[PDB]
Each structure stands twice: as structure tokens, then as C-alpha cells.
Ligand binder design. Structure first.
Ligand SMILES: *C(=O)N1C[C@H](NOS(=O)(=O)O)CC[C@H]1C(N)=O
Ligand SMILES: [Cl-]
Length: 261
């Protein structure tokens, strides 16, 4: 009751729509809030795309070293790493790291293209047992986050279950799983989101995202000090097309659902 009331109060205060799913692997419990509603994933979808490449690599060992041309024509709205490599190549490993750790949207597009496009990323999700996830579009349009639009959405429950599988479970081979985890732990973009609601000593691997309608998201694997890990999805979106980011709402949600652990 208490956690639910606190999340409803946070949602009310925020003015928007909040989705939370926490999986606590200590006792196999969950904390859920709007966990079966759809939310635009925005850049949190990059985890699935990187995982698809990692899966592909299991049957093509030299895949991560494969070189990909970066051209001016590849540039999109947010190219912090790719802009440095125009007219050269990046490896699929470098593209994965750039997508996950700097949220480079060119890098995401290369991951998407490599595996066959959004419908291939979606088919991968289905193969894992995630029947909720849908990647419809490429970057940058996948971030529009229009209310009522199912494109490029998932639910907090599904994404928490899938992230658990990918990082802590057996979706990926041991080398590939370790690589995903290392990439996520090295994320540079998440300090203001879930991490901001957790004690400083906890270790986090996360992937943030943002989009239209003030959409502000984060998904994380969390290793509390001397505890079994957690998986947390916090998705948030707002009524106004040009609403401001609210990373603080994600931090507040994280604090509410972890208080006491
Ligand atoms: C992902 O949501 N996109 C790419 C980039 N992500 O950075 S974030 O994860 O720190 O939000 C910027 C926002 C967004 C986009 N609109 O392209
Ligand atoms: Cl602290």
C-alpha cells in the first residue's frame, strides 16, 4: 500500500504519466505501477538493438570487429560520437558502445540496419519471449512519443523482464552478456536519472532516453551493496508536446521503490 501511495503521489505532483517496474532478485518480488501500459521507449530501445547484434555475433564470431562506414548522410539529430568518425569506419563494437554509453543515434541506426531493421529487432524480442516490445522506426523519428501512438513502445513490466533476461539471465552467451553489462555499467548519461535516487555506493548499469512530450526514461540493472541485484524501469511522459525533461521524477521513483533495501 505505502509504496503505491507514494508512487501515485509522485505521479500526481509531476503532472504526467509514470510507469515503474522493479524486479528484486533477492525474493523474486516486483513493484509495479502502470506496468502494463505502453510508453515510448526512446533511447532505452538501444539495449534491445545492441543485444540483437550481440546475439547475431554468437553465430558469427568476428562480427563485433566488422567495420561500418560513417557518412555525412548518416548524421541525424544527436551524433556525439559518430560525428568524429565521418568518412571513416567504426566497428560494430564501437557502435554498440557509442549507442549505449553516449546515446549516439547514428550508432543506433547502424545497429538497427545491421540486423535487418526495426522489424528484425522486434523479431529478436519475440524470440526472447518479449511479446510487448515493438520497434517500428529508426532514429530520429522513433522518439516522437505522441500520446496514444503505439509505435516504438513497450510496457515497464516487459522491459524489466527483458532487461533482467539480458543482463542477469541467459538470453545471451556468457561473453556477450558480460559485454552488455560492461557497456551499461560504463554509461555516461544516467547520473541524473535512476542513479540520482539510489545510494552513492550502489553499482548501476543503465540506459536513459528522452523524447517528445517531455518523455524521460531510464532502465537499469542495480547491484546494491551486499545484496542481490535489482532491475528497474522508470518511464515518464507528459501532456504537452514541448514539455521539459523530468529526470528528477525518475530519481524520485527509484528512491521510493528502493527505500529500505
Ligand atoms: C534517446 O532517447 N535519444 C538520443 C539521446 N539520448 O540521450 S539520453 O539517453 O541521455 O536521453 C538524446 C535524446 C533522445 C533523442 N530525442 O534523440
Ligand atoms: Cl548515499
Amino acid at each position: 500500500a505505502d509504496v503505491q501511495q507514494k508512487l501515485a503521489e509522485l505521479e500526481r505532483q509531476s503532472g504526467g504519466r509514470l510507469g515503474v517496474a522493479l524486479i528484486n532478485t533477492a525474493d523474486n518480488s516486483q513493484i509495479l505501477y502502470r506496468a502494463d501500459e505502453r510508453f515510448a521507449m526512446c533511447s532505452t530501445s538501444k539495449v534491445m538493438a545492441a543485444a540483437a547484434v550481440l546475439k547475431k555475433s554468437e553465430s558469427e564470431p568476428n562480427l563485433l570487429n566488422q567495420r561500418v562506414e560513417i557518412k555525412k548522410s548518416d548524421l541525424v539529430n544527436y551524433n556525439p560520437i559518430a560525428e568524429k568518425h565521418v568518412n571513416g569506419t567504426m566497428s560494430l563494437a564501437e557502435l554498440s558502445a557509442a549507442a549505449l554509453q553516449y546515446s549516439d543515434n547514428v550508432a543506433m541506426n547502424k545497429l538497427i540496419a545491421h540486423v535487418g531493421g526495426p522489424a528484425s529487432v522486434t523479431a529478436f524480442a519475440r524470440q526472447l519471449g518479449d511479446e510487448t516490445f515493438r520497434l517500428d522506426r529508426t532514429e530520429p523519428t522513433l522518439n516522437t512519443a505522441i500520446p496514444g501512438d503505439p509505435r516504438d513502445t513497450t510496457s515497464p513490466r516487459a522491459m524489466a523482464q527483458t532487461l533482467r533476461n539480458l543482463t542477469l539471465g541467459k538470453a545471451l552467451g556468457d561473453s556477450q552478456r558480460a559485454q552488455l553489462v560492461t557497456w551499461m555499467k560504463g554509461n555516461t548519461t544516467g547520473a541524473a536519472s535512476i542513479q540520482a535516487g539510489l545510494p552513492a555506493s550502489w553499482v548501476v548499469g543503465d540506459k536513459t532516453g528522452s523524447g517528445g512530450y517531455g518523455t524521460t526514461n531510464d532502465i537499469a540493472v542495480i547491484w546494491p551493496k551486499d545484496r542481490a541485484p535489482l532491475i528497474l524501469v522508470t518511464y515518464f511522459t507528459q501532456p504537452q508536446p514541448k514539455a521539459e525533461s523530468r529526470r528528477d521524477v525518475l530519481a524520485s521513483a527509484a528512491k521510493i521503490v528502493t527505500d529500505g533495501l
